[PDB]
Scaffold this motif. Structure first.
Motif, short mmCIF file in Angstrom:
data_model
loop_
_atom_site.label_atom_id
_atom_site.label_comp_id
_atom_site.label_asym_id
_atom_site.label_seq_id
_atom_site.Cartn_x
_atom_site.Cartn_y
_atom_site.Cartn_z
N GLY A 191 0.80 -1.21 0.00
CA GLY A 191 0.00 0.00 0.00
C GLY A 191 0.84 1.26 0.00
N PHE A 192 0.15 2.40 -0.07
CA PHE A 192 0.80 3.69 -0.16
C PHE A 192 1.37 4.16 1.19
N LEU A 193 0.55 4.13 2.23
CA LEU A 193 0.98 4.61 3.55
C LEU A 193 1.50 3.48 4.43
N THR A 194 0.94 2.28 4.28
CA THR A 194 1.46 1.09 4.94
C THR A 194 1.52 -0.07 3.94
N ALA A 195 2.39 -1.04 4.20
CA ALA A 195 2.56 -2.18 3.32
C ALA A 195 1.27 -3.01 3.25
N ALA A 196 0.67 -3.27 4.41
CA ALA A 196 -0.53 -4.10 4.51
C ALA A 196 -1.75 -3.24 4.84
#
Lengths: 265, 268, 265, 268
Positions: free
Chosen positions: A249-254
């Protein structure tokens, strides 16, 4: 066991992922010829797997040494079913701007001779054996073969080059030899002599799976492709095997950290 | 004129697609510096465009020559806005089994030094100018950077490598310099190979290869590069890969195009 | 001007990117037929571009309304050179886990009817005109057509579906009509009635280019594909046009923030 | 036996590839729940595998039926480790121009409800169980999810949509549940289409389609799914897309395979 009676040749098998693969393949009942530079690490590996491994000391950049390896495998084990060109060197993720002018030429050759030419030569050396056995080639690629920031321009270019090898050799060697690629990433782990990420950040921003797997957990994809009767429809296949780097993802991986509470499960 | 005031540097710009790019860019109001090995052909384009094109004879494999091309561009026109690393050599589509054991190591170096390293050195050479202008790199790739049977393993591996350079350099040069790839196919250029390496014409296999059903003139491939050179039009693009190959990657199984029976099916 | 004499039909052209495209195309000398739902916004657009735009009030989900649009374009302007199916609705990035059971079916239809079926119908309605003109189709995709986290499963599926349309229709309509896709992302900006990122984070983690472009800066790619004589070799092409979302780094979007000082430039 | 103790739920598992998957998974020591429309064929696999397979008759388009399949799996075997959304219908490769105006809206819904929505509902139905087991989703895609001419626009668009579901759900379900796609091709299953829609056999075009040069038995496609169902082997994989189609995406221009002359060229 998954690979009883199978014979594989693994380049760069004396250490790292290559050694984990040797160990796994042998545990799965395979016989394994290994080409690598270290005579000592090779003899150690031979004794670890008495009768199920043979070590060939040599330079993966050398066609003649790749041919010596193919020949030794045939002499010890009678055939080559699966070739796994896997030896690679890294570039310290050295950015173009940080590659010095007086070292870039040398570095280009070092990394490309190993990472691309050594793969070309391995396949070339093993081609008679693989056609004879109607076998297959499983290249070790990398997340650097698909996305940026897994290496500098040198390493990233070499691993993208290998994707090209998967495609062209799947075409050229059809219908006799299948050719596929495993692209590992997020593992635990050396670059050329001309050249010279925190776990928290790795789990949060890079790896959706939220952990860095042990090397042994990267061996299963290769067992799959080497398994007699499980990969017959696969040629030109590319298996991203990197903890979800391409789907982060953009702000976090998951995106699913809260699911267990969210679902009352 | 879409590129008025802009300055481009094009490697391999004295022949083939490279020369078509030079003419188009000058026609669009750009000034162009060219790095190429042919002195005669560099003279031809210099006379053709007067002072709007300057040539420098040199070897794309040499960082020194790439730096001299950049230096020359700066001396002539004062900046570099768009770099088009474009020079490439083919491998005669020589299959792995057909690469002779005594030539394969030399062939590898020749094709990788030109197609991959020469791209690296061009960006290296132009990086200060490109960062200063907040400029662009447009790499020439190939259908061979995406699909098989457009070259042997050597060529196919180099153009795949160039896809890696688009991705990695888009990342490394951001946010200042945009980096994208155009991947031409069906061009029918005279694909020169290395001296170390000692097939079917496009026309003869067209309906197995190109859905567009026709063989574009070289000029037809220049429009994608103009787009990437146009700051007002391409600002959001970085890391992009534009296949520009008559539809090679969307060709059918039995024939390239699916719409042979379309016009009769719709009348008019 | 780039598009003098050209005729385009743009669905969802009354607002958003579609309106920016109408405005750009007209400024470039094109004539533009627009299909959209708002009668008022359409009449406003017609008056803005007196003689160079025509507005057709209708439902992009309706084949009959798409055909009305094609017909009106032909009646006003005599031909259709470039079709731009562009109308789309979003899903609020609503995760599967957050899609309620009693609304998911309805939501599926709403978003798929607009985002995929409306594209199918636009092309279907315009097919005689496009074959006649030997024209082209330029689909508006999205970063959601290639990467996760640009939408929920519904929106992401619809935009991946459009990539399928690019490929299959490039094949089916060859050699007569070319079919390509522009995949914008990182722009400034509505979802179905059944359903209901900070700039700092956007510039640092999502967008290598380090800024969110104005809508007008997304119009150039469409002018390129619509330009007589510049895109003839292109069919089945996919132009990611999203600020570098697919080439973003692991810890930061861009790797080159320090270059200007690094290079003493 | 590579899947001892594991539990799978397979939609469309009573025929074609789905039934081959059921047999393979049971053979590997898994217990399997199946959702399918054929009562007769669900009975056949139940008798075949005794208590190691349980069938539930239902419509993959219905979330209710997907929840009933999950509930049944839980009642029978106590958990769900791997979900294989696999049920799909074809579109007879009907071209856009050939989709009749009075049938196209219904055909759209029929094929999208089965191929896309039914995949969404299967995951929705199984999500609590899959999060609990830290399990896996293996979507069946198709060559039609990557390349043209494997279906018409309706089918091709649905399988491309499924690629989106692999990517988005890999992201949304991480770090607990891994989501990947297998994309079979060359299977020669009896591709059933919608009632609303009223071509060349694979054998007849093999050398234009499959580099592998042979037509795999259905059993040959089950190995990729076993791999994704094997926790000790596939732990690093999420968001992966495995083309499993005899090499359709790496086929040549004139013929699918490039190595017809290979064995004579190397002797032996």
């Amino acid at each position: 066991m998954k690979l009883t009676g199978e014979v594989a040749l693994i380049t760069g098998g004396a250490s790292g992922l290559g050694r984990a693969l040797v160990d796994r393949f042998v545990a799965e009942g395979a016989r394994v010829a290994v080409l690598d530079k270290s005579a000592e690490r090779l003899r150690e590996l031979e004794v670890a797997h008495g009768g199920n491994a043979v070590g060939v000391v040599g330079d993966v950049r050398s066609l003649q040494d790749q041919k010596r390896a193919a020949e030794r495998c045939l002499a010890a084990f009678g055939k080559i079913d699966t070739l796994i060109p896997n030896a690679g060197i890294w570039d310290y993720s050295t950015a173009l701007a940080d590659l010095p002018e007086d070292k870039i030429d040398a570095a280009f050759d070092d990394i490309f001779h190993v990472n691309v030419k050594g793969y070309i030569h391995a396949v070339k050396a093993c081609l008679p054996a693989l056609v004879s056995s109607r076998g297959s080639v499983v290249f070790t690629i990398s997340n650097a073969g698909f996305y940026p920031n897994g290496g500098g321009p040198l390493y990233t270019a070499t691993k993208h080059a290998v994707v090209g090898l998967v495609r062209q050799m799947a075409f050229e060697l059809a219908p006799h030899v299948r050719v596929n690629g495993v692209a590992p990433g997020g593992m635990n782990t050396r670059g050329p002599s001309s050249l010279g990420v925190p776990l928290a950040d790795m789990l949060k921003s890079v790896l959706p799976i939220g952990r860095m797997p042990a090397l042994e957990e990267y061996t299963g994809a290769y067992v799959f492709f080497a398994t007699r009767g499980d990969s017959l429809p696969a040629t030109g296949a590319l298996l991203n095997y990197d903890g979800g780097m391409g789907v982060r993802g953009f702000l976090t991986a998951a995106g699913g950290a809260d699911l267990p509470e969210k679902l009352n499960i």
